[PDB]
Paper text:
A key step in the assembly pathway of double-stranded DNA viruses, including bacteriophage and evolutionarily related herpesviruses, is the packaging of viral genomic DNA into the procapsid. During this process, the large terminase protein docks onto the portal protein, which is embedded in the capsid wall, and translocates DNA using free energy liberated from ATP hydrolysis. Cryo-EM reconstructions reveal modifications to a canonical capsid protein fold, resulting in capsids that are abnormally large for this virus class. Structural information on the portal protein, through which the genome is packaged, demonstrates that the capsid influences the portal’s conformation.
Single-particle reconstructions imposing icosahedral symmetry were calculated at 4.4-Å resolution for the procapsid and 3.7-Å resolution for the expanded capsid. In the case of the expanded capsid, there were interpretable regions for side chains for most amino acids, enabling atomic models to be built for both the major capsid protein gp89 and the auxiliary protein gp88. The model of the major capsid protein revealed the canonical HK97-like fold, with major insertions that result in a supersized capsid geometry with an increased lattice constant. The extended N arm reaches toward an adjacent capsomer, forming a “crook” in the expanded capsid, and contributing one strand to a four-stranded β-sheet. Moving upward through the capsid wall, two further antiparallel strands of the β-sheet are contributed by the E loop that overlays the P domain. The outermost strand of the sheet is contributed by the N-terminal region of the auxiliary protein. This interaction is observed only in the expanded capsid, as the auxiliary proteins are only present in the expanded capsid, at the local and icosahedral threefold axes. Only in the expanded state do the E loops become stretched, adopting a well-defined β-strand conformation and creating the binding site for the N-terminal strand of the auxiliary protein. The auxiliary protein trimers, present in the expanded capsid, further stabilize this state.
Author numbering:
A (entry chain C): 1 to 52
B (entry chain C): 104 to 409
C (entry chain D): 257 to 307
D (entry chain B): 206 to 256
E (entry chain B): 53 to 103
Amino acid sequence: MRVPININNALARVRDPLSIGGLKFPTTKEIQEAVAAIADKFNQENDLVDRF
Amino acid sequence: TWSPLAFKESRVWDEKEILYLGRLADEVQAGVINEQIAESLTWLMARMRNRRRWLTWQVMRTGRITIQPNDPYNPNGLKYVIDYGVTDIELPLPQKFDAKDGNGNSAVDPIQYFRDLIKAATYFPDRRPVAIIVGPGFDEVLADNTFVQKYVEYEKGWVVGQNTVQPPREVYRQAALDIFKRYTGLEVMVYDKTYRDQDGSVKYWIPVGELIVLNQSTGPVGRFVYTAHVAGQRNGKVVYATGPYLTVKDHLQDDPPYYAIIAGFHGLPQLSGYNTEDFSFHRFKWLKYANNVQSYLPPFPPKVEL
Amino acid sequence: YEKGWVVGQNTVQPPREVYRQAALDIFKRYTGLEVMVYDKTYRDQDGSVKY
Amino acid sequence: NGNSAVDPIQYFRDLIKAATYFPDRRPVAIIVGPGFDEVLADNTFVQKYVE
Amino acid sequence: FPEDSTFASELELYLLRTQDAEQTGMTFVHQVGSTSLPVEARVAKVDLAKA
């Protein structure tokens, strides 16, 4: 059961809308994005007994 | 005498859930609960395969299968003791294999223990073991005890004062299982899959410190057999079906509209080959061989909860 | 003596299985006898199997 | 006699074992500047491995 | 450390993390005769990060 999310739009809509706080003018910047999968790899089904 | 069991469980989806479901960041139509019910269908399928494997693991583990109202996945509380009548389910070890007294001296001898099990099951030609299926690090218990070290040192000639200085423990465990297999003949299988229980700590399927023993051959110990459930009136009369079923129900016209999926099955494992002259059943046995095996194992990562 | 061992300089301690695999052979070879093993049994009236 | 403190081969072997399930951490290579054999030749556990 | 160069003056990274649910559970047990009961609930999680 995954969260019903679109990762591209959610990953694009975190970037700040206006947010001039630092230098009192908008700076130049570069942004790279990456997602990550998280699972428990060590929860494996008990494949032994169906063989028997 | 033999008699099956029954299993069933349900879902539901109300009107607010079917009508309102959008994606979390995209802006789309009402079409997400269609994709959402398919995961519940697949989850009920895997949820039934887990009870097949659970019943069969329970009969291999304890011989009997025991259901009781304290169980997690039992709301009904149906108490059951289905005693399959395994004669001697466990093998006695008063002092375990990794039990040392004094200064490095061990207590018992594993290779000799399986040797006189084979010898004292001579004229019972069905109690005489063939294979072992042990999961965790088992070579270390063969590598630290006294007698199997003395057998490796007998075989490789490595007397400590004259041939070589002292071999490391790693050189012991890289051949201890092989000399064990050669001096007994029990083909040892390994099965090291794991399940994450509610502690958050990884445990193997074969528990550490225990090994199973098959008693006549490696093969099917009986079978798991389903029985028939109800499917309704193909022509005018009731015609059954046999496997695990899964039923969907539309109530999207009713007040309020809802939607429910129901799956379940009927079945129970059966032990086919019994003894004839006596009514015994010596086909698989357990034994707990050591106590401190987790210290021989690498640690496991925590579950990321983010 | 017959196999070429010593408990200090060739092997550590040979197991009992090698002793019983070689003992009947060296018994036949030293004594010059002939061993006819005979294993057939009969039930007693007490249920106990007896040779 | 010269029985040292830490067996370095067992030390790095324990670092490789205790990062079996942490594959980002399990070390692979090692850079050392000065004379490094001048310490391994003066370590009793390493000398026993050599013997 | 190799050399690369950019005409811009800041670099930020956005990392998103996703923990889908695992299909645990076991089918409930009832006697032939009875109506069914519903299963439990579970949760998946999504987090983010900046640089």
